[PDB]
Amino acid sequence: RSVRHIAIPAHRGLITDRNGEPLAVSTPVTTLWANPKELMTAKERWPQLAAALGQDTKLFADRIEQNAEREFIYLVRGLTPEQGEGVIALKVPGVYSIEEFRRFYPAGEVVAHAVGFTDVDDRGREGIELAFDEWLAGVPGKRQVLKDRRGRVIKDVQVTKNAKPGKTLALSIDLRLQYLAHRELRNALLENGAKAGSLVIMDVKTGEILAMTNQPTYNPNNRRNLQPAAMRNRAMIDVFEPGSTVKPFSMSAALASGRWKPSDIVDVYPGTLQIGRYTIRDVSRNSRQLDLTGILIKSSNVGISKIAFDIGAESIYSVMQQVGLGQDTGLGFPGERVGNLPNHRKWPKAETATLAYGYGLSVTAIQLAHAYAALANDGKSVPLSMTRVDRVPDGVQVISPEVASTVQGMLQQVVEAQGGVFRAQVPGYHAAGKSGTARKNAYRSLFAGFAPATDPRIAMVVVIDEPSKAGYFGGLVSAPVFSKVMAGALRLMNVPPDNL
Ligand SMILES: [Cl-]
Numbered sequence: 001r002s003v004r005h006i007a008i009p010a011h012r013g014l015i016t017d018r019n020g021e022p023l024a025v026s027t028p029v030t031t032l033w034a035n036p037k038e039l040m041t042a043k044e045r046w047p048q049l050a051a052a053l054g055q056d057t058k059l060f061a062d063r064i065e066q067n068a069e070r071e072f073i074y075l076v077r078g079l080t081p082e083q084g085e086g087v088i089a090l091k092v093p094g095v096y097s098i099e100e101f102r103r104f105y106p107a108g109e110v111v112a113h114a115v116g117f118t119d120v121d122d123r124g125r126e127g128i129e130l131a132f133d134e135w136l137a138g139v140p141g142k143r144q145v146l147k148d149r150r151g152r153v154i155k156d157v158q159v160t161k162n163a164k165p166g167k168t169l170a171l172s173i174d175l176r177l178q179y180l181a182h183r184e185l186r187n188a189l190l191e192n193g194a195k196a197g198s199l200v201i202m203d204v205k206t207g208e209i210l211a212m213t214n215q216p217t218y219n220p221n222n223r224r225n226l227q228p229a230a231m232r233n234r235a236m237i238d239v240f241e242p243g244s245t246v247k248p249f250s251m252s253a254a255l256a257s258g259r260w261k262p263s264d265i266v267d268v269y270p271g272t273l274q275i276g277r278y279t280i281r282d283v284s285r286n287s288r289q290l291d292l293t294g295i296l297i298k299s300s301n302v303g304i305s306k307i308a309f310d311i312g313a314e315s316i317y318s319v320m321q322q323v324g325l326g327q328d329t330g331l332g333f334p335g336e337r338v339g340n341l342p343n344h345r346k347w348p349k350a351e352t353a354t355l356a357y358g359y360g361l362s363v364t365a366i367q368l369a370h371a372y373a374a375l376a377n378d379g380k381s382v383p384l385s386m387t388r389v390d391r392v393p394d395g396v397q398v399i400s401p402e403v404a405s406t407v408q409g410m411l412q413q414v415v416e417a418q419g420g421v422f423r424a425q426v427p428g429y430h431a432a433g434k435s436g437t438a439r440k441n442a443y444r445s446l447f448a449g450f451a452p453a454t455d456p457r458i459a460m461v462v463v464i465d466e467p468s469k470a471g472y473f474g475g476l477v478s479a480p481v482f483s484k485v486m487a488g489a490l491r492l493m494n495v496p497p498d499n500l
Contacts, residue, residue, distance in 0.1 A: 008140055014026070015170075018172055023175070028102075030079040036067045094152075131334060181485050192467040198463045199212075199462050236337070239339045242368055256403050320371075329364075330383070368448055374395075383395070421433070424475070440466070458495075
């Protein structure tokens, strides 16, 4: 009475972590539908079927009566096999059974922002599920079915074309590192009364994003009553002024200029500096002469500004642009922001000073981590990747190996020297990094670093949004998170200790 071609759903590819742990799995679910044309000939069966579907008798009957002309309506999607057989056993004419695919996410909220989710039609709508949708979805088949003049699926003819299953995808993320970072960022938020946060971990040798976690987060397996703020992958889609965490790059421009060495001295007394109506102000103001390492340890805005006036903002802009701040990462992640590294024909003094200590530009947590990776990797930037990297692509030298080496040594002193950020110290290793405290009377606390300082393997960025306890400095709020997560990450990757 009617020959028709209908789609065959393809099996969606498995997403694993870098070691094969499942992160997104296509699982069979039982969906029930009905042909109202057939139901209309068995009305005396409707109340038992309605009750079986948890439905009010009258509302069910109103539904079928309204659709009496159509030949298809869903009844309920995604049931257990025991549930569907429970209904089919009633043998109600025109009630049919189907098996579909539905994603399950074994790690739930721990990796929701990176993995994303699919819709009820099994299409990728967010995160990796969307970015890699063509790779994961495969290609539907087609089959030929005969249907009588009332919609009854009389015969089932051949398969015209088989479905092509999707392909497996292994991410760069290490699920063991991801759990640790997730736990500790969460603990830090709760201990500090903070509103939001991000943590990014990167392999400085391969470009791999080993961990990417945010708060708040959500359970992708139960998205009822989902708050869209809980769904933001802040590490990639939120932009912020990085503040003093960019001082290592200002310093890289200074050491490359020919005009400065770490033992050179800047006079920062009295801890402020007027630029017209604008006033640069240090956080501690009992200093006069400081050497370049001292400027980083004390995080003196006056110090880095006087250095910036000497070498010119253009050279600072250039290093920041070369390491990727405010530049397109090329990951193609949905909603991923680029930020902004402003430019000028001639840089005014005030813009020059603020650029040098990280105001006036916008970056993401992932760009900041990638810039620190380039610095840890002896000045060579390796392309970012969200998937496991087997053949490493060639990187670009963006800071000279000698300059990067020197800046690494200074940042090890930031963490280890007297008056330094002692809370970022990693037991059994040497660590290097810089704190940040940036306006947003509310602040973001930041720490960016890498370890082991002797032979760097891992770069990490911690951002904690609006800590509400008395201490809000990056060195008080974010540095201890770096310490706990870096220690766990190095242990898990069996990195040999360089400080025992
Ligand atoms: Cl943008």
